[PDB]
Design a protein around this ligand. Structure first.
Ligand SMILES: *[C@@H]1O[C@H](CO)[C@@H](O[C@@H]2O[C@H](CO)[C@@H](O[C@@H]3O[C@H](CO)[C@@H](O)[C@H](O[C@H]4O[C@H](CO)[C@@H](O)[C@H](O)[C@@H]4O)[C@@H]3O)[C@H](O)[C@H]2NC(C)=O)[C@H](O)[C@H]1NC(C)=O
Ligand SMILES: *[C@@H]1O[C@H](CO)[C@@H](O[C@@H]2O[C@H](CO)[C@@H](O)[C@H](O)[C@H]2NC(C)=O)[C@H](O)[C@H]1NC(C)=O
Ligand SMILES: *[C@@H]1O[C@H](CO)[C@@H](O[C@@H]2O[C@H](CO)[C@@H](O)[C@H](O)[C@H]2NC(C)=O)[C@H](O)[C@H]1NC(C)=O
Ligand SMILES: *[C@@H]1O[C@H](CO)[C@@H](O[C@@H]2O[C@H](CO)[C@@H](O)[C@H](O)[C@H]2NC(C)=O)[C@H](O)[C@H]1NC(C)=O
Ligand SMILES: CC(=O)N[C@@H]1[C@@H](O)[C@H](O)[C@@H](CO)O[C@H]1O
Ligand SMILES: OC[C@H]1NC[C@H](O)[C@@H](O)[C@@H]1O
Ligand SMILES: OC[C@H]1NC[C@H](O)[C@@H](O)[C@@H]1O
Lengths: 391, 390
């Protein structure tokens, strides 16, 4: 989407995977979708260095609506859980130096069942723009035919542009189109800052595996569409929660940066391990995700329950991610000739390889002729940066 | 097995899951099955407080044999990876105040392919007893028919008793027998200090779930056989390794204590988080696994992606483990009336409930009439101890 926005992949936070559709403020106040929730997440992002890291978009997800619309025809917040309305939440958010994201649906209902945007595309867009929204997640539940999905998705893009406001439009167009026919990513790219590709994400090394595996499966179709202003969305960062071990949390971080995925944390910020914070806030690794060049990574090689990913970065740099898919035994050794790395460019005549994950460590120089040895942890990932030189 | 042994479930450590059958000492010396491996694990168990915790059995698994037997007769260690022989390893291990375990097979070959024990039952047994072995894992690969499995398993048990030596006999009888016919656990109990029931274990929350899920599935059949001298083995403690998150590692610890499973750590002791060390060495939680009464726990209730387990302990005590199987969102609330707990005994007229896991915390008194409230972590377990008034 030629809108000036998402020049690198959007970073921020999103309630869904951690807070889902909890609307019982009575017994579970500390996790119902209330303004205070975002009031508090926002408040933190600032004080805990999430902004300096580069997370900027506090994003509301599904389950913020009232039962129905006011009498014009406009979406409202919940009067109970959002007494102050979005108008003020926006104001507050902004004062913190952040941007606010919101949710709505292409259909007749959200995936939860609160009013859809259909028929109301023109009016929702403006309604949002009046509030001070800086992002939209546009979901695609409750849709008759592909024709409505397509026209609906497109029609919203136009209505947002018209408002006059810089609003990151994030779409789920392909995910929903998928089961019926291949999506025209070329065309999608035209209307959406970024698009959701596969199933929802869990707190499971299983779910992760299946995303990478499905992603890598049809990379031929998606890696190339990806660049400045339009990204492949493999869904939220779940690091900080419960489901993944350390090496699985690295694997997540590494491959999201490799894949040039947007980085949307979905977690209680108020209870997070030094572990994960420091991982989530890794300067070097955010860089790689955030590389100005904007070429998506891919799966170079595979087999022997090992996986090789790599991403080209600007300045003759390249990222190498090596995964170990054997769940059993110990650290396994895996080695390749740097001759096979970066299509053969980085490391001609030589490259400087420093390791970023699981721990930050310079490794020597590396002639064209040489091989890189390595011990990767079961279900973990080793993340290298290869630099050019000349020495 | 009426042998004076495993009066509470055996604790120690086992190479397999973490080190497997790595025999390449050239390129991976830090993890090949070498005496120095056991020399090192032993040395640590001592210094790191693993012994004081109650881990006592340093256990060699598969892949310690030579190509073939001496002439006699007898099984040998690898000349290269075990130059000093088991004789000496035993001696050393003992001097640390620990007990050595070894491995062999019912069949013609181990699961790897090194000589089986068949035909050699009488001689293997003695061989081991000469070496000073204190445990045997008897595996059941490479077996024609169930008859040989049965007779082979049994025959060994007698040969061991006869040696004259206290040797904890750990069998894999049921697991192999399964896929053909239900096992007679009554019978097995008679010959084995503990028995492996299900598939191997991985470094996966998957694998865990499936073990509990399979165990609770047929608890009818197995929970009652269990008690002093004969345990159900749900396979190794894998905490400390790579594959499980914290709340998954607690879930494992809690439910191993609930189940009255033996505690066999399989990990590199030389590189382990404070996290895991403290969890593996939890006094209170070992106690519950170690309760002298020795009744196995079971699944009280299930549904709503929540699971309630409970074990009765001596002295009107009971353990309650509540697991949360929803892998999404956050801490879920789950509650029941203490009236339902421990068949209705603990908490009549009242109980003291202190939480052990995830963090050790007293909770007040709990009248008969009261319900216990609780926020359990996704894939975690909350593990309580109920003391009845009284
Ligand atoms: C909605 O309507 C249109 C529909 O596409 C959209 O117009 C486009 O807006 C962008 C806004 O930047 C324009 O892109 C610019 O093109 C000119 C060159 O002619 C440059 O000034 C801009 O350069 C910036 O970005 C560069 C690209 O990487 C950077 O290198 C550089 O540093 C600059 O900062 C940018 O390329 C584009 O020309 C128009 N297209 C049209 C229709 O003419 C509009 O912005 C949208 N409006 C809203 C409110 O959503
Ligand atoms: C180990 O393998 C040998 C086969 O070489 C078994 O001995 C034979 O087993 C078959 C039964 O399937 C008998 O019919 C033969 O008479 C035996 N052959 C000989 C030459 O003695 C042996 O019992 C096997 N044992 C186990 C437990 O698998
Ligand atoms: C071999 O078998 C006998 C009988 O099962 C074991 O005897 C029991 O051993 C414990 C410890 O000696 C006693 O507490 C029980 O009272 C014994 N019961 C019987 C039947 O006498 C014996 O210990 C075993 N011996 C060895 C060394 O393996
Ligand atoms: C499983 O085997 C057990 C143990 O042998 C069987 O119980 C024995 O049965 C014999 C008669 O066949 C009795 O005389 C013994 O007293 C029993 N042993 C003991 C001490 O219990 C048992 O019947 C078998 N189980 C089933 C249900 O098939
Ligand atoms: C996107 C969508 O399907 N919207 C529906 C439309 O099909 C239908 O004409 C009407 C009654 O169902 O209400 C609305
Ligand atoms: O609630 C439905 C759900 N579909 C998929 C998205 O991840 C989520 O935010 C959206 O709200
Ligand atoms: O190969 C030996 C190996 N076979 C499978 C068993 O279950 C495992 O624990 C044993 O050590």
């Amino acid at each position: 989407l030629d809108n000036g926005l998402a020049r690198t992949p959007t970073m921020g936070w999103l309630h869904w995977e951690r807070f889902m559709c909890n609307l019982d403020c009575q017994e579970e106040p500390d996790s119902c979708i209330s303004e205070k929730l975002f009031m508090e997440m926002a408040e933190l992002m600032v004080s805990e260095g999430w902004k300096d890291a580069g997370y900027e978009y506090l994003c509301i997800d599904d389950c913020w609506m009232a039962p129905q619309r006011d009498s014009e025809g406009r979406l409202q917040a919940d009067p109970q859980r959002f007494p102050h309305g979005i108008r003020q939440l926006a104001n507050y958010v902004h004062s913190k130096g952040l941007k606010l994201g919101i949710y709505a649906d292409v259909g007749n209902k959200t995936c939860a069942g609160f009013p859809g945007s259909f028929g109301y595309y023109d009016i929702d867009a403006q309604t949002f723009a009046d509030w001070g929204v800086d992002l939209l997640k546009f979901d695609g539940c409750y849709c008759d035919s592909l024709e409505n999905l397509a026209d609906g998705y497109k029609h919203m893009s136009l209505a947002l542009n018209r408002t006059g406001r810089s609003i990151v439009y994030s779409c789920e167009w392909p995910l929903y189109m998928w089961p019926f026919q291949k999506p025209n990513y070329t065309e999608i790219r035209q209307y959406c800052n970024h698009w959701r590709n596969f199933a929802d994400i869990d707190d499971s090394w299983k779910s992760i595996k299946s995303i990478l595996d499905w992603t890598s499966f049809n990379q031929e179709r998606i890696v190339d569409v990806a660049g400045p202003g339009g990204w492949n969305d493999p869904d939220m960062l779940v690091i900080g929660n419960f489901g993944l071990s350390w090496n699985q949390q690295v694997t997540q971080m590494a491959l999201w940066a490799i894949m040039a995925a947007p980085l949307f944390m979905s977690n209680d910020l108020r209870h997070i391990s030094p572990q994960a914070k420091a991982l989530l806030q890794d300067k070097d690794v955010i860089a790689i995700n955030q590389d100005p060049l904007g070429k998506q990574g891919y799966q170079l090689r595979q087999g022997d329950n090992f996986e090789v990913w790599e991403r080209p970065l600007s300045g003759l740099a390249w990222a190498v991610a090596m995964i170990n898919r054997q769940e059993i035994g110990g650290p396994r050794s895996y080695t390749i000739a740097v001759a096979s790395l970066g299509k053969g460019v980085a490391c001609n005549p030589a490259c400087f390889i420093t390791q970023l994950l699981p721990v930050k460590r310079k490794l020597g120089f590396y002639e064209w002729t040489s091989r890189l040895r390595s011990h990767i942890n079961p279900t973990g990932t080793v993340l290298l940066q290869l630099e050019n030189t000349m020495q």
